[PDB]
Amino acid sequence: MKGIILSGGSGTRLYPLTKVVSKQLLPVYDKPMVYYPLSVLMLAGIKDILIISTPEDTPRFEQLLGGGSELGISLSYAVQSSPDGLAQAFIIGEEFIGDDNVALVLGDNIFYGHGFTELLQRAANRKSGATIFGYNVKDPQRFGVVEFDEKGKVISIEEKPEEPKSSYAVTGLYFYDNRVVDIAKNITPSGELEITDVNKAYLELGELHVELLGRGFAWLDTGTHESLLQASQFIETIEKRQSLKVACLEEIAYRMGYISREQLIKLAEPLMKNEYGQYLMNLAHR
Ligand SMILES: CC(=O)N[C@H]1[C@@H](OP(=O)(O)OP(=O)(O)OC[C@H]2O[C@@H](n3ccc(=O)[nH]c3=O)[C@H](O)[C@@H]2O)O[C@H](CO)[C@@H](O)[C@@H]1O
């Protein structure tokens, strides 16, 4: 399975922070925002990843992350000329995807919870159908909304429904089989090519599966100044009090066996006259 990070968009709501800096390059505590969704692809077991951003921002992401070899993965880059919908990721990413299954994660989404990687690995390993992730939010009408009623079997999915039919937002993380590329080509503007029609396609096939994230999963709003700060405080809090790191790419690569001890030490050194190395050195001499 391949992955795609859709990491473009306008800065507007975060202005002036985003006047000369890409949204998904802003700090979330101690890491660029894009580390977080990248880490979710990695934890899923996905090692071949395309990062799509604006023509302006895409060279900056390449500069940050390069081709991915120091994490033991492959990163490629393409450009979204204009933000005409999430489903465009599959048109732009058509050649990258090939015949493969593919996950899409949004560059501003932040996921956390103790059972989360098992959930990612399971979704990555379903060769058929689509898996989405629902999250109990206070303001359903601001997102995609999924209704189920079971048994947890999906019954409808509406984008920003004037009145909602559940408390469950459809978060910015989606797993697909290869049929998604023909599906994206075949949907029509709602002016956006919308991820919610992609998901309605799987639903009419009866092959749209939802993971409901309840106690105790986090999904962090990254949209406003206040919610960016909240996200940052959450990561710091959980890292400081529970002695773990969230989305530490180097740690994740090492723990999944992608890179060796010696490769990790090399990644940590240039970072030693700082903290972030130190946690990496502690880990590399187990
Ligand atoms: C796509 C859409 O209509 N709604 C989804 C979108 O809502 P939402 O209301 O967040 O719409 P956004 O435009 O903020 O989610 C889009 C995010 O991806 C980026 N972007 C958007 C379009 C594009 O062509 N390229 C691009 O990179 C935007 O910069 C933004 O970061 O994400 C939510 C989860 O986070 C979902 O619950 C919604 O179902």
Short mmCIF file of C-alpha atoms and ligand atoms in Angstrom, two decimals, residues 6-10 13 23-24 80 82-86 88 106 108-109 142-144 159-160 170-172 174 192 194-196 219, ligand 1:
data_model
loop_
_atom_site.label_atom_id
_atom_site.label_comp_id
_atom_site.label_asym_id
_atom_site.label_seq_id
_atom_site.Cartn_x
_atom_site.Cartn_y
_atom_site.Cartn_z
CA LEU A 6 -2.30 16.18 0.97
CA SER A 7 -0.54 19.15 2.43
CA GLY A 8 -1.47 22.13 0.34
CA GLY A 9 -4.22 24.67 0.81
CA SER A 10 -4.36 28.32 1.75
CA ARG A 13 -7.32 31.45 8.81
CA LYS A 23 0.75 25.91 7.41
CA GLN A 24 2.09 22.33 7.54
CA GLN A 80 -1.49 20.89 -6.57
CA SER A 82 -5.07 24.87 -7.07
CA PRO A 83 -7.05 23.48 -4.14
CA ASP A 84 -9.94 21.94 -6.09
CA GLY A 85 -10.67 19.14 -3.61
CA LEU A 86 -9.24 16.21 -1.63
CA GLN A 88 -7.75 15.41 -6.68
CA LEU A 106 -4.41 15.40 5.41
CA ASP A 108 -2.95 19.22 9.06
CA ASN A 109 -4.47 16.22 10.80
CA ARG A 142 -18.30 21.43 10.45
CA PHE A 143 -17.02 18.10 8.96
CA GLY A 144 -17.93 14.99 7.06
CA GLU A 159 -20.32 16.62 4.03
CA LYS A 160 -21.12 19.41 6.50
CA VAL A 170 -15.03 11.74 9.27
CA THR A 171 -11.41 12.57 10.05
CA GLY A 172 -8.77 13.33 7.42
CA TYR A 174 -8.72 7.35 4.48
CA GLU A 192 -14.42 20.68 -5.55
CA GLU A 194 -14.86 15.88 -2.94
CA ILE A 195 -13.55 13.11 -0.74
CA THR A 196 -17.10 12.63 0.54
CA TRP A 219 -7.81 14.06 17.10
C1 LIG B 1 -12.69 18.00 1.93
C2 LIG B 1 -13.97 18.51 2.51
O1 LIG B 1 -14.75 19.19 1.83
N1 LIG B 1 -14.21 18.21 3.79
C3 LIG B 1 -13.31 17.41 4.62
C4 LIG B 1 -12.28 18.39 5.21
O2 LIG B 1 -12.97 19.47 5.88
P1 LIG B 1 -12.42 20.99 6.14
O3 LIG B 1 -13.65 21.82 6.48
O4 LIG B 1 -11.26 20.94 7.11
O5 LIG B 1 -11.86 21.51 4.74
P2 LIG B 1 -10.17 21.81 4.61
O6 LIG B 1 -10.21 22.75 3.24
O7 LIG B 1 -9.65 22.73 5.90
O8 LIG B 1 -9.63 20.16 4.89
C5 LIG B 1 -8.93 20.58 3.84
C6 LIG B 1 -7.48 20.61 4.33
O9 LIG B 1 -6.70 20.01 3.28
C7 LIG B 1 -6.20 21.05 2.41
N2 LIG B 1 -6.70 20.94 1.04
C8 LIG B 1 -7.98 21.13 0.72
C9 LIG B 1 -8.38 21.03 -0.61
C10 LIG B 1 -7.41 20.79 -1.58
O10 LIG B 1 -7.74 20.69 -2.90
N3 LIG B 1 -6.11 20.65 -1.21
C11 LIG B 1 -5.78 20.73 0.09
O11 LIG B 1 -4.48 20.61 0.47
C12 LIG B 1 -6.59 22.38 3.04
O12 LIG B 1 -5.46 23.24 2.98
C13 LIG B 1 -6.91 22.00 4.47
O13 LIG B 1 -5.67 21.83 5.19
O14 LIG B 1 -11.46 17.64 6.12
C14 LIG B 1 -12.18 17.17 7.28
C15 LIG B 1 -11.22 16.43 8.24
O15 LIG B 1 -10.05 17.24 8.53
C16 LIG B 1 -13.32 16.25 6.83
O16 LIG B 1 -14.13 15.96 7.95
C17 LIG B 1 -14.19 16.86 5.74
O17 LIG B 1 -15.06 15.86 5.21
#
